[PDB]
Every structure is written in structure tokens, then in C-alpha cells.
Symmetry: C3
Subunit: 137 residues, 3 copies
């Protein structure tokens, strides 16, 4: 079940020094996002930093959304997760994709340029319309 | 894809003191949930508090569920997120929707009545039927997990 | 709506000492997962431990994934959540299902053999192929719509 998604490269290192995001294995649900940075960033325990990806997507189909998630190795082994926990990307967002990286653990961690620091899945979504009732029975 | 969902305005402040939940933009995936409180609540760093939404929904369709999530601005800038991280709402749950608000950050934060403090999406769900096997049809990923594909 | 998932039992207690995961009601979205431990694990505030389930699943269909989540009661009342926040099980994984348990709260907590410590849903997923373009809410994000 494939879907074409338009993407605009904002930093010319993307697609060259920093490969475009890809699925690590053929049945992976998420694609890995890379940190678009000149220099490594040291995250002390408790600190948050906003990491640019250097690209923008336009999902455009209002029956689809994306969810940014931590990776399980970074999250479990190093406490490197997301500051907003889960990042919900709307179908009508055109801006640069940004990653809120938060050190939830006890050890300092150093994010390298180009590192695969989070992942992103695409999921069908349903828009609800409310039917106001006085009681459900 | 639009679906009509029954909702009971369990707390009549919702729709009167502050607006009913709606989709912030046309192409928004989630709808914002508001703090149904009589008094402001100051959350010190590390603290949690249980905030009512004033709403009960009945999805009723077992092929659908809802998920409650933090908002990205409150979460990234102020460390205001969920105490259970992600809230899962069953299709046959029709009690009040409650929000566990947790201050994961280093500065205190005051939740005001009516404030949009989290968001909710509706997603399709599949119910699994387990088939016991002796061997798997092996794959390239195999048993690999927890960072086996590397950092770079 | 329903999908057949291959499962292998790795610990003989699973299905004998305590049940295999089951949907509690016909309208339940998730299945509860039980800690398959020999000895209870003490978790100080801020600690993380990796908890086996005694089970391996193989979803096998690349338009489907599973998401592991905290339970709302354990999360809100005791701060017992997931160390990777949300656990994403891929269609081509067939290792042991493992739960990263993190004590995010201010009080110690002990993970007990057999305790229902997390839950898991299965959701459809779509794999994307990129189309490079020069030009395409607008660009508004991270709070732009306000809170009032
Ligand atoms: O909570 C979890 C998360 C993942 N897993 C396993 C199954 C999943 O398919 C595999 C990899 O998941 P992620 O891709 O989300 N994490 P990461 O990218 O760090 O690992 P990998 O390098 O193997 O892809 O780890 C668990 O058993 N429990
Ligand atoms: O953030 C939440 C999460 C759940 N809920 C409601 C809806 C859901 O259907 C119900 C049960 O969710 P969980 O299974 O996550 N909680 P728990 O397992 O602790 O309680 P139960 O024993 O009733 O399943 O609680 C909320 O109001 N807010
Ligand atoms: O991790 C994220 C989350 C969101 N975003 C962008 C895309 C999304 O469409 C937009 C808004 O997301 P939320 O609605 O979850 N956050 P918030 O409600 O604070 O911002 P807004 O007022 O713009 O809706 O922000 C990111 O770039 N990274
Ligand atoms: Mg991975
Ligand atoms: Mg928003
Ligand atoms: Mg439950």
C-alpha cells in the first residue's frame, strides 16, 4: 500500500550528505528522519532541543496524517525521545518538519549531524462530525 | 473520510463558557480538547493533575478508536504533555473523557479554564486473531530491534 | 476488521500461569500485555527496565503495524509508562515482543510477575514514496493557532 508524497528540499545537504528519509527494512512501518545540523549537539539530562530536518512534506490527502515517534533503541537505551511525545503532522501542513528532541534519562547524549534521531509513520485518519445527544440510550 | 459520532455534553459549561471541540484547520488531523475546570490549576514541575473535558463520546463502531495526544507547542515549549503519554479510547467506552496532564519540564505552568491543552484523532483499528505456529516465514529484519539498523 | 497474526510462545508459562492476550469486550481497541518475569523488578524514580512478554508475533502484512501504549491508570496514578513512549512493532519483525518500562514519577514502583503493564493496538499503515518538487494552515505549526 504505497502513496506518493510531495517533498521540497530546503537545505541543499538533504539528498547529498544527508540522505532523504528511508525505510530501514522492507516491512518497516516508519521512515527514519535525519538531523540537519552543522555540528553535533550535546543534550544534557532534562534538556530539549528543536532539530531541523531540512525538508518539507505536503501530504495533501485529508484522509491521511503522519505521526513522528521515538526510535526504540534511542528511547529505551538512552532516553532520547520527543518533547511533545508524539508529533502529529496534518495533511495541510507545508512547513519545515521539525523534531522536538528531549533527554528524558539520566545520561548526557550527543546527537550527530545526519543521525537517524526519530521515525515517522503514515496512518489513515477519520474526521469526526459530532451528533449531540442527551443520553446514549 | 467523515464519520458521525454521538457525543453527550456531560458538563454544560462546554459550548457555553468555552467552545465545543472543532478542527482547528480544514486539513487538521486532530481536534483540540479544552480544560473543563472551575478554577485555574498551577502545575509544578513533575506534578500531574486530572482535567475533565466535559464530554462523553460513543464511537460505537468497533473498527474505529480514538487517541489523545499532547499539542506540539505546549509539549515542546512548556513541557505540558500527558501523564499516560497517549490516551486510547475504546469504541464501547461512553463515560467522560479525562485528560492526565503532566508537567515534564522545569518551569511551573498554570492551566486556565477553557484552555486548549491536548488533541484527539480518530483512527481505524484491526482486531487480531492469533494463529499459533512453530516456525515463522523468515524476513530480513528477523529478530532485529532496538537500534539494530544503526545510528547513521 | 479482523486479521490473522502468527504467534510463537517462547515461555511455557504464557497460556498456563496467565492467559494469552485477549480483547476484553467486542468493542475494545487494545490487548493488555503481561510481564513475563521470574523475579519482580524494583524501579526507582527515573529508572528503565526491559520486560519480556514470553511471546513473538509476526504481523507479516506491510499495510499493518502494532503500537504499544501505557495503560491510563498505571500511567496517571503511578507514572509507569514506556521508555520509548510508544512502541512501534513492524510487520517484518518476529523477535520477542519486549516492553521498555520507565518510572516517570516521583515514587518507587515494582513490576510484578504477571502484572498487566501495557496494551497494544493494531492499525493500518501506508508506506510513502517521495516525489521531489520545487514548489507545492499554510506553514503554521507548533502552537500557531493559540490556546484560547
Ligand atoms: O516497544 C518496542 C518497540 C520495538 N520493538 C521491536 C519490534 C520492532 O519492529 C523493532 C524496531 O522498532 P523501531 O524501528 O521502532 N526502533 P529502532 O529503529 O531503534 O530499531 P531498528 O534499528 O531495529 O529499526 O523493535 C519491541 O519489541 N518493543
Ligand atoms: O487518557 C485517557 C485514556 C483512557 N480514557 C478512558 C477511555 C478508555 O476506553 C478507558 C480505558 O483506557 P485504558 O485501558 O487505557 N485504562 P486502564 O487499563 O487503566 O483501565 P481499565 O481497567 O478500565 O481498562 O479510559 C480516558 O478517559 N482518558
Ligand atoms: O513534532 C511535530 C509536531 C507538529 N509539527 C508541525 C506539523 C503540524 O501540522 C503542526 C501543528 O501540530 P499540532 O497541532 O500537534 N501542535 P499545536 O496545536 O501546538 O500547533 P497549531 O496551533 O499550529 O495547531 O506543527 C511538527 O513540525 N513537528
Ligand atoms: Mg527502526
Ligand atoms: Mg494544533
Ligand atoms: Mg485497560
Amino acid at each position: 500500500m504505497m502513496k506518493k508524497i510531495d517533498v521540497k528540499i530546503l537545505d541543499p545537504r538533504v539528498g547529498k550528505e544527508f540522505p532523504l528519509p528511508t525505510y530501514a527494512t522492507s516491512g518497516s512501518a516508519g521512515l527514519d528522519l535525519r538531523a540537519c545540523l552543522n555540528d553535533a549537539v550535546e543534550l544534557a539530562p532534562g534538556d530539549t532541543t528543536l532539530v531541523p530536518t531540512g525538508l518539507a512534506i505536503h501530504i495533501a490527502d485529508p484522509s491521511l496524517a503522519a505521526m513522528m515517534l521515538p526510535r526504540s533503541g534511542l528511547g529505551h537505551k538512552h532516553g532520547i525521545v520527543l518533547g511533545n511525545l508524539v508529533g502529529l503532522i496534518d495533511s495541510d501542513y507545508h512547513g519545515q518538519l521539525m523534531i522536538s528532541v528531549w533527554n528524558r534519562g539520566q545520561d548526557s547524549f550527543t546527537i550527530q549531524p545526519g543521525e537517524r534521531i526519530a521515525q515517522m509513520i503514515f496512518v489513515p485518519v477519520v474526521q469526526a462530525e459530532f451528533n449531540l445527544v442527551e443520553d446514549f440510550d
